Amino acid sequence: GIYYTPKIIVDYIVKKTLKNHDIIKNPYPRILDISCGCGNFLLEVYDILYDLFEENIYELKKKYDENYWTVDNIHRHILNYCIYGADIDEKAISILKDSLTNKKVDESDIKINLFCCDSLKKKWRYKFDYIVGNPPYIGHKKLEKKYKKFLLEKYSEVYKDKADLYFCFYKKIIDILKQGGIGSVITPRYFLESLSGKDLREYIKSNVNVQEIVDFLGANIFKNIGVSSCILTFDKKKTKETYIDVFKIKNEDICINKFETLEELLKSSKFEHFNINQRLLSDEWILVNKDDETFYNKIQEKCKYSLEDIAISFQGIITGCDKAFILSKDDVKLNLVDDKFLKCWIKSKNINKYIVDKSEYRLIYSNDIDNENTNKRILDEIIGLYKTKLENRRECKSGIRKWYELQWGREKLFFERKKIMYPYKSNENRFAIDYDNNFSSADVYSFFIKEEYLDKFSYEYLVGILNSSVYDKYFKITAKKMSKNIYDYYPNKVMKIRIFRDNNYEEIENLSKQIISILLNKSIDKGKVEKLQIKMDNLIMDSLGI
DNA sequence: ATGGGACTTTTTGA
DNA sequence: TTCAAAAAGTCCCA
Ligand SMILES: OC[C@H]1O[C@@H](n2cnc3c(NCCCCCc4ccccc4)ncnc32)[C@H](O)[C@@H]1O
Ligand SMILES: [K+]
Numbered sequence: 048g049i050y051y052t053p054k055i056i057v058d059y060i061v062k063k064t065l066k067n068h069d070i071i072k073n074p075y076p077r078i079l080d081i082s083c084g085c086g087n088f089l090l091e092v093y094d095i096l097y098d099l100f101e102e103n104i105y106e107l108k109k110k111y112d113e114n115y116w117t118v119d120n121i122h123r124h125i126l127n128y129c130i131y132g133a134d135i136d137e138k139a140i141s142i143l144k145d146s147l148t149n150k151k152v153d154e155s156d157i158k159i160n161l162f163c164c165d166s167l168k169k170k171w172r173y174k175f176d177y178i179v180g181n182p183p184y185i186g187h188k189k190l191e192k193k194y195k196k197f198l199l200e201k202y203s204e205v206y207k208d209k210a211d212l213y214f215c216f217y218k219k220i221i222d223i224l225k226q227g228g229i230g231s232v233i234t235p236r237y238f239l240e241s242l243s244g245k246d247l248r249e250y251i252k253s254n255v256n257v258q259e260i261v262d263f264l265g266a267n268i269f270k271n272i273g274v275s276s277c278i279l280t281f282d283k284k285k286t287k288e289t290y291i292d293v294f295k296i297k298n299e300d301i302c303i304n305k306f307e308t309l310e311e312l313l314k315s316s317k318f319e320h321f322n323i324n325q326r327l328l329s330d331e332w333i334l335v336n337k338d339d340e341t342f343y344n345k346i347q348e349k350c351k352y353s354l355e356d357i358a359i360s361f362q363g364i365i366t367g368c369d370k371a372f373i374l375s376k377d378d379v380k381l382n383l384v385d386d387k388f389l390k391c392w393i394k395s396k397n398i399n400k401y402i403v404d405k406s407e408y409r410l411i412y413s414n415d416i417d418n419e420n421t422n423k424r425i426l427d428e429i430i431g432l433y434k435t436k437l438e439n440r441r442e443c444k445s446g447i448r449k450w451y452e453l454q455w456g457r458e459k460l461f462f463e464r465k466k467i468m469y470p471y472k473s474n475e476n477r478f479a480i481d482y483d484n485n486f487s488s489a490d491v492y493s494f495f496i497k498e499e500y501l502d503k504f505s506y507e508y509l510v511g512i513l514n515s516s517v518y519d520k521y522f523k524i525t526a527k528k529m530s531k532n533i534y535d536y537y538p539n540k541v542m543k544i545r546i547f548r549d550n551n552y553e554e555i556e557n558l559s560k561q562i563i564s565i566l567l568n569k570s571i572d573k574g575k576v577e578k579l580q581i582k583m584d585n586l587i588m589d590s591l592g593i
Numbered sequence: 594a595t596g597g598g599a600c601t602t603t604t605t606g607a
Numbered sequence: 608t609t610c611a612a613a614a615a616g617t618c619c620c621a
């Protein structure tokens with residue numbers, strides 16, 4: 048588990064923290080990487096430091112011990128007092144020690160401050176002027192349970208529930224950064240918007256000044272790695288303004304090596320720059336330009352309801368082993384299953400704007416199987432094919448579920464009604480009215496309108512505005528950006544969407560019903576639908592005053 | 594190939 | 608008892 052940061056980003060991160068260091072005022076800077084690995088960052092730090100000392104060698108010689116400050120002594124001084132590294136992989140440390148040693152190319156026993164340890168457990172004996180690197184990322188599924196108990200116990204300020212391991216590295220880096228120190232790291236971007244990152248965001252904002260955020264959105268920074276990156280630079284300097292530079296990429300299809308340096312890319316048309324006042328950050332960090340902020344605030348102020356106010360949200364079925372319970376609707380095995388047990392089953396791709404595709408799969412709602420003797424053929428010939436994997440689910444091992452039951456079968460009556468469904472990850476808003484009692488896994492979310500809000504909001508009106516170009520832009524302002532052309536559509540944000548009622552209600556709803564009626568007929572022509580959508584977008588923009 | 598596009602399971606803490 | 612979040616996604620092709 049060793050990952051390579053592209054050289055252009057490494058140089059930017061090191062230059063960011065060291066470009067303005069006053070080596071004459073302080074010729075003993077402590078630069079640390081608690082993830083150093085083989086030394087992607089530290090070896091570049093050595094090069095930057097060596098030039099810095101060499102360019103001012105006579106000034107140091109005059110101001111300080113003139114026998115100590117010579118070009119010949121620069122190498123030894125850097126390793127003794129300046130470069131610090133830590134990594135849990137001793138093979139990586141051994142390689143980095145050879146690399147630092149070979150920078151000069153025994154005389155006398157030069158010591159190198161490299162620690163092979165868990166950086167989250169090391170008793171750090173002092174703080175550091177500059178901290179750079181790329182921490183490990185490990186989510187809640189892939190982190191060992193025994194280790195996770197330690198993080199919950201000792202890193203509770205930033206790590207709880209579905210948090211990530213790199214949250215704790217942010218915590219450690221901030222804690223061991225000197226007063227006036229500067230830190231710069233590349234991490235996943237998700238903590239900027241994710242629900243899990245709320246505590247971490249609060250910790251950063253209240254303990255450091257965030258100088259700069261480079262947000263690569265869905266661009267693929269790490270080749271053959273499914274992750275989305277950002278670069279954060281922060282300091283512990285006494286400043287009275289604390290404004291953040293935000294560099295947000297404009298096109299995710301860029302290759303990172305367009306120029307020789309990352310600065311050229313950031314100042315180019317390929318990025319956009321804007322400023323955010325750190326003191327105006329709430330638990331949410333809404334990092335958008337002034338046009339988007341004006342747009343976002345207009346909608347928030349005009350809308351007196353949220354979806355959570357008026358609707359009941361729920362996540363789909365989690366069977367725990369889909370292959371055991373999900374069959375093609377033309378599978379011959381379904382003749383063994385009484386149709387009282389069978390439900391229509393759709394995937395996220397079956398959701399379009401305003402309507403759902405006809406289902407091609409069936410779910411065996413195995414909870415309603417009374418016992419193991421009356422429906423033996425279903426258990427023996429269909430579900431029992433995966434009995435080993437089924438028995439390994441957590442609730443089966445604890446005895447809460449029978450081996451053939453659905454892990455989280457939810458409540459049938461929630462799905463067997465008129466409701467709205469949307470995919471959990473999509474490039475655009477796709478909210479559909481479900482007329483067919485469709486069930487689904489957790490890749491599709493559903494909601495239905497509360498009974499007391501039915502005389503104010505109809506399903507037809509909701510899919511109308513929710514699928515509009517206005518609401519697509521509006522939702523993406525604060526949505527969690529996952530990968531290229533993919534946003535999370537999860538209730539923790541979808542239910543915070545705000546909605547309105549005014550004089551345009553009837554016409555918006557009527558346009559929605561025409562769209563639905565066209566989308567459902569046989570000789571379907573989408574052309575008029577696009578025109579109707581353009582007209583509805585005009586009404587909505589009129590309604591919200593944008 | 595390795596870079597790009599289509600599509601999305603069930604484990605898990607609370 | 609039972610909710611919903613979580614991409615160092617996953618997998619395939621050219
Ligand atoms: O990938 C990023 C780089 O960072 C290094 N690293 C990874 N984790 C730590 C680290 N503490 C966290 C350790 C988490 C281990 C989780 C685990 C526990 C038990 C069994 C199994 C697992 N402390 C220092 N360096 C680290 C990698 O080696 C790598 O070079
Ligand atoms: K001197």
Ligand SMILES: [K+]
Pocket residue numbers: 264265266267268273274275276529530531
């Ligand atoms: K990406």
